[PDB]
DNA sequence: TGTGACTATGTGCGCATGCATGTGCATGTGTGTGCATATACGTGTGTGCATGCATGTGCATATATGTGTGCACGTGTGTGTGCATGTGTGTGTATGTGTATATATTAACCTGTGTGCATTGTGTGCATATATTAGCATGTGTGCA
DNA sequence: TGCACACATGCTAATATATGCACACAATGCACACAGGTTAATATATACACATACACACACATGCACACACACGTGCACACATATATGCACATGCATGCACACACGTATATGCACACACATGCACATGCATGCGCACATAGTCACA
């Protein structure tokens, strides 16, 4: 859990994601912008997943809750049920 | 035959917030389109919520969760209050 | 029988609770519908309608108009951040767009 | 000593990571980030192991697809270096 | 009905660009825009006609267009749906 | 004779057409285009008058939104005139390809 | 308890197209997700088609129209041919 | 009575016709489900499964692999124009991306 | 850099139009009423499993160094695009008409539901052995000076 | 052309993951029996397509030149590639709480059927806000002093 875990998404990790996206050169300001984008994306998905969990009267977020939340946002994911 | 719409109810709401303001027929059609659209989104999400939890009935709890899923931040909070207040008032008078 | 009271009046709502209940029943959403589900849904629909109509009425008043037209609905929705998100993939007929010119295109 | 020209190792890394399928973010730091974000919605939440895995799979897929769109915006401006304005334009066009 | 795409005239395309905030237009935009509109119309009309067949009708109604637009994520208000 | 400098009346048109809501494509040529396209799907097809109006409303809204995205791509490339590659980029990012 | 999936049916399909090719558990899960996703898309479209036409029954005609709306051009043509052939054989045999 | 045979064998299908009927009936799609609807739906699901599996098996063979993995499913879908359109908004876990480098980034 | 001329958008002012609004028939639908039925819920249960801890290697991360080269800035030039003019033609509006057709009514009948029973296929839990993964020398294969 | 670096390749052990198997059981199929949704035939009103007419505003083509885009060149610092120390993620186990799921009894609540009013939609005027156009003020543009 902890605090300030967005720094755990390191610059080499962001670089690897950019390489998979076919990016050759990366400006130094990309890493801070990428962390903000990821946090916004995760906040939207996790908020909906917890809402599904709360409706089920559960305390554990399941893979199905994440899958339903992703489907709710038009980002359906295969391979987790 | 009779074509049901929400026009007469939208007009009643309009007189509550703007007693001296009218509405055009084309604008009324858009408001009718908006109500049907939001109805289908909430009812569809509530229907899936009952199916995910192996429930066969849609209750106010399913509607409340669907409203939170579909509505943005402040809209969801205020809509939940109106829905809860109406339900509380409804059961107080049977 | 006693005097027939509409469920909308019982819940203090202008939107039809009975019609919403029937639409839920015949809409193929679930085999059963709770008593409070149409009341909750009708209240939410009434609240959202009031939010748009209040904003659109202000837009109509700004343009010195007493009648709401599709343009006023478009101005109300797109100028409200939360309504714009809810209706982000919705086209409003005869609504136009918001006046917006990029600063780079303005003369210097 | 042998030294590769700038962009030669970058091109090799593009071929290397476009060929593999493993997750590119470390699992434990990502799990801590998920729990910290979730604590703002509920207290003392638990996560299934596959729930975090599903989140990481979607997060990395979202970021990789965004970088692909970001790369096109940079090339459109006759550049080869992605910049924050490249990301902002891609997200604006996508509707985010 | 032959070669009606040229009915989308240059002044019509320019007016659409002005509403979009475009200040300057290249001469190659007009042919590119016509191809874009042609592709968009085919997708909506094909679905709208498909709805017409299922109803066993020969008249494309406004609801058929509305349902076709909704299916593509392009919900339109003000035409009965 | 008086002559406005280039781009001066273009900005006037932007303000004019962003204030109004009327359809910008002529109705009759658009109706002919709709019927021509529907021929490849059926023969002897009739259209409701509101069906063609719904198609025109969606078509113009789609094109105007595309031009807004196209304009941002041109400005991103430090230009003020939209080009076909600007449209192609916007559709590619949008996923309309 | 018992969890229901399409894994056994996907495996039989695999053994016809590729008799000597196996599938991983992760790939089988993706195939199960794909079948459920396509099922929900088609059934949802067919359900809306019946409601639009004031019908209470989902028939093969609704399924066929839903296939044409959801699948891309050449995929839809072959899918329609497969569905029509199965219904004809099913009716001819019973 | 007679020896019971499944409707899948009657329709000449491998996907479960009887289970699709139950999923349609209990899925809250309509009040009634016709006899031909599950047969048609099962055949379409079987055909789409066969189309992806035969393309994924080709990708596995191209990689000298005898077992289909998520990478082969992703390669099959993204290299097929129609299947990419059908699954355009779908993320396949552990599928990766297509090898694609813009020519401007290639060495001069 | 202020200043006159030119143009175009905006602001009342006056006036007709058609379109929104209020007023009744009436009918279909929501309501009140018991009634029976089944879903959901509270209670308890046992078990998986997620959390936290402790240990270990070694892989990846962070830091610093040098430098190539891409970004950005400025320059200039051609031409493509905007602006404006004159002309006609195709659009918009109104008018009318015949025709195809979408709609509604009515009878009936076929198909889907419902119910219960027989039972076969399906999923679970285990063996089993295959393909996959991990090394180590070789074998190109590209980059780079 | 030769050197150094990285990815690949035939190669052997090892294992963990997939494959196949046996068993109960829950869901599928089979057989009625019922009933209502759907079809079909008819009639009817609708509104769409077709033609006709007019006037005129818009589209088309032209001529003119402005300034925007594109190429070019310059320099600089930003970012890549590299090396080195090191933090820490990964794997591995071990223990325990604890939450999740099953199972069950059962009351609460929802559907069902029916009578019956009344709320809602269609149709009917009606008047009033919007549109239309004239004149006039007024912000803005673009040479020019």
Numbering used by the authors:
A (entry chain F): 21 to 101
B (entry chain H), G (entry chain D): 29 to 122
C (entry chain G), H (entry chain C): 11 to 118
D (entry chain E): 38 to 133
E (entry chain B): 22 to 102
F (entry chain A): 38 to 134
What is the paper's account of this structure, in its own sentences?
The initial cryo-EM reconstructions of the nMATN1 nucleosome in complex with OCT4 showed a density near the linker DNA, similar to the density of OCT4 bound to LIN28B DNA. Focused classification and refinements improved the resolution to 2.3 Å in the nucleosome portion and to 8.1 Å for an approximately 20-kDa OCT4 region bound to the linker DNA. We performed MNase sequencing to determine the position of the nMATN1 DNA on the OCT4-bound nucleosome and combined that information with the cryo-EM map to build a model for OCT4 bound to the nMATN1 nucleosome. Our structural and MNase sequencing data revealed that, despite the presence of multiple OCT4 motifs in the nMATN1 DNA, OCT4 predominantly binds to one binding site in the linker DNA, near the nucleosome entry–exit site (mOBS1), a position overall similar to that in the LIN28B nucleosome structure. OCT4 binding to OBS1 on LIN28B or nMATN1 nucleosomes stabilizes the positioning of nucleosomal DNA, to expose internal TF-binding sites, thereby facilitating binding of additional OCT4 and of SOX2.
